[PDB]
Amino acid sequence: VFNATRFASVYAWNRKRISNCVADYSVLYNSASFSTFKCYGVSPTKLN
């Protein structure tokens, strides 16, 4: 999703389904990656 080489066009976009897995969001804060990261509906740090 994030590290894919080329995403889908914004005109026709591909919705990826993430289910049955473990989401580790601590890697984002340990290693700085996202330049712009914001959460409208929830808190950025509480996603984990």
Partner: protein
């Protein structure tokens, strides 16, 4: 007009793009690690180039 008893001024220097993360309730490598403002913070944030 309104004056105060004790005035504390924390002086330091940061990278250009890191000034936006100084404010109450902000999140980032600044507020989280090196320097953090209280969520109830009452004061004035100043910066210049």
């Amino acid at each position: 007009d309104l004056c105060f008893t004790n005035v504390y001024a924390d002086s330091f220097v940061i990278r250009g793009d890191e000034v936006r993360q100084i404010a109450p309730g902000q999140t980032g490598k600044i507020a989280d690690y090196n320097y953090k403002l209280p969520d109830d913070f009452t004061g004035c944030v100043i910066a210049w180039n």
